[PDB]
Structure 1
Amino acid sequence: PIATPEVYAEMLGQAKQNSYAFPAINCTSSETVNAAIKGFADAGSDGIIQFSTGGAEFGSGLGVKDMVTGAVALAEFTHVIAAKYPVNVALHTDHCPKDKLDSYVRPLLAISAQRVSKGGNPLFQSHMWDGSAVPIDENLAIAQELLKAAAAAKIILEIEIGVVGGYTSPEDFEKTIEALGAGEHGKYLLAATFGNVHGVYKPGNVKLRPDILAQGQQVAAAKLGLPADAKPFDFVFHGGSGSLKSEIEEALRYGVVKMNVDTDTQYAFTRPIAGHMFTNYDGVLKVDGEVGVKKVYDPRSYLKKAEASMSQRVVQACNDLHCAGKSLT
């Protein structure tokens, strides 16, 4: 089923306590949502589906190109499908910068607040506010207003300090903790940047420093007069694709509960489609006067292959993040 806010909070709480994390898989369509959930279910794991602004716009179709519509349509699809699986699936929206808040996060928050006031659950269980392109103080100020709105909709806010490419400071950690607290003001996830980069590159290109995360927890713990080993932040690891298994295990140790994967699942989806087209070249194309072969230009023939391949990569992520076999069900 779709994770209720209570289940989602327990998912993240148990992951934090036990040092594992959930893959958050970017999805653009019915096929990729199906692939991601089957992946979670196959791994016996709960999981996160997320829609970027570009992904939501894509999902709304070329005739609409409206993020809210695409997000809502894909969410409504997902609510029906997820009901048929025993694992818990949370819906999340991915980076929303300042100039998109009004056209994406804020109206989605409103939709959920309306559902909640009627005694139901929010459509999405978390939304990301990405303010990494403005100064930390502006970012946190916007975060504080968004947190009030999110809390009323029973939604968890994710925020970003520092930049993801295509290294957060100790003082930034303190400001954040001073502004947002440890979650009394409502639960939030923190994407702090330790060298992470969107996309997949020749390995060794991207230099991760998970120790930045360790230091952030210590500084926050000290500010809050908590245990030295306390972990006041729930971290998010952006740019998960192409990461080393040892990088991942270290980040898990420091309180990463969510790791975003997009590029590697994109490659997994597309790879068997390219393969289908090449091996079936003379059935997918009408060649030498022939009319082609319906069985192979039927989109389901190759999209089922893409789906299965993407699921298998999701199962791999569940094992990399140690959430495999951990579904709260």
Structure 2
Amino acid sequence: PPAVLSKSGVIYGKDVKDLFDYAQEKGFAIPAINVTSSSTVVAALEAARDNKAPIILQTSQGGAAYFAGKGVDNKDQAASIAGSIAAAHYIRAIAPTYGIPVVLHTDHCAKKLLPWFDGMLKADEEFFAKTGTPLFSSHMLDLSEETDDENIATCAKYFERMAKMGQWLEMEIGITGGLYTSPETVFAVYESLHKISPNFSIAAAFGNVHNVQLRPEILGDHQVYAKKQIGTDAKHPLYLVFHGGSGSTQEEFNTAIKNGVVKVNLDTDCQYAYLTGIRDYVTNKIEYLKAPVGNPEGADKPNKKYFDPRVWVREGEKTMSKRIAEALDIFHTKGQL
């Protein structure tokens, strides 16, 4: 067990790596939950603390923009940069309060959206200039719609800006430049990035879209390739990330983790869960009228105790946390702290 398992709050640099290394070692993966509000942040932080598990909390470009407010325009990425950095502050401030270690990350960033990645890494650098630590734990680039050789050229240039602050980077690659992704194209990315820093993870195409069936076994192939191309004893010389894995079998997850996946993304199954408990507050339908709670007093009995947001929102957090709990069990992440 490294330092991280006993840490509290968001984590950075080597610590991130330790965690992932640990993850591979004991054979669990860590859920990365998308968050859109302080409330949803809480929901997940609480789940992780209640289940003695570390957690990755990420914000997508939309998510980030929501942290900002849906009323700020995004014509130049302003909303996601503002939002993203405010979320990073809030997350940083509260995370320590739960007993666990947290990885603050950002989801899918394509070429089209590179401005956002600029803004965020702008802050990272100046935060590092003040604290000795970046704002976010990691960041992601999704340039899989471009060409493999371009794709890693943009990851490279970025990843050497990033390595100055020991930041982690995750990049996704698919079947385009020069079906599923070849053990070779994976090794190509590791070959061009590992020279810089070891703080990188890969999202490969393997029958998981975000006709084409899921083949987690391919991830094993990616490992046995680099293993041989480096001549290491290391079973898992790659840090692998599972996108769109929602609703798969338990043994699909198994083969993916045993094949060294350390991070599964959860997003829309949490969204539904969040709504689920707040929606069940349609059971206080007539109590959702301003001053008159029909049940006991027609129009002369106040219902501030029914419509206080800290009663019904909380009901939604509870059901979101519960579904995150299910996931911490499934990925063997529960009880590793």
The normalised TM-score by structure 2 is 0.87
Aligned to 2:220: 214
AA at the equivalent of 2:85: V
* 1:66-105 aligned within 5 A: 66-102=79-115, 104-105=116-117
- Gap regions ≥5 residues in structure 1: 199-204
AA at the equivalent of 1:77: Y
Deviates more, 1:64-73 or 1:27-36: 64-73
Give 1:62 shift: 2.5
**What percentage of residue pairs aligned between the two structures are identical?**
39
AA at the equivalent of 1:280: N
Aligned to 2:45: 37
Give 1:131 shift: 0.6
Superimposed CA distance per residue, residues 78-115 of structure 1 (whole angstroms, 9 cap, x where no aligned partner): 1121121221111000001112122x122212211222
3-state secondary structure, aligned to 1:150? helix
Aligned to 1:274: 279
Aligned to 2:324: 314
3-state secondary structure, aligned to 1:76? helix
CA distance in structure 2 between the partners assigned to 1:320 and 1:313 by the alignment = 11
CA distance in structure 1 between the partners assigned to 2:305 and 2:174 by the alignment = 49
Aligned to 1:255: 260
* 1:118-133 aligned within 5 A: 118-133=130-145
Structure 1 residue 46 and structure 2 residue 50: aligned? Answer: no
Give 1:188 shift: 0.3
Give 1:4 shift: 3.2
Structure 1 residue 138 and structure 2 residue 138: aligned? Answer: no
Structure 1 residue 3 and structure 2 residue 17: aligned? Answer: no
Aligned to 1:226: 232
Aligned to 1:108: 120
Superimposed CA distance per residue, residues 99-139 of structure 1 (whole angstroms, 9 cap, x where no aligned partner): 2122x122212211222233421111100011111121111
The normalised TM-score by structure 1 is 0.89
- Are the equivalent residues in 2 in contact too, given 1:27–1:50 (CA < 8 A)? yes
- Are the equivalent residues in 1 in contact too, given 2:160–2:196 (CA < 8 A)? no
Superimposed CA distance per residue, residues 210-258 of structure 1 (whole angstroms, 9 cap, x where no aligned partner): 011011111222222334x631111000123222211111100100011
Moved segments of 4+, more than 6 Å:
286-289
How many residues in Structure 1 have an aligned counterpart in Structure 2? 314
- Are the equivalent residues in 1 in contact too, given 2:12–2:166 (CA < 8 A)? no
CA distance in structure 2 between the partners assigned to 1:52 and 1:119 by the alignment = 25
Structure 1 residue 304 and structure 2 residue 309: aligned? Answer: no
CA distance in structure 2 between the partners assigned to 1:306 and 1:207 by the alignment = 34
- Gap regions ≥5 residues in structure 2: 1-8, 74-78
- Are the equivalent residues in 2 in contact too, given 1:45–1:323 (CA < 8 A)? yes
AA at the equivalent of 1:320: I
Give 1:299 shift: 2.2
Q: Of the two, which has the highest radius of gyration? A: 2
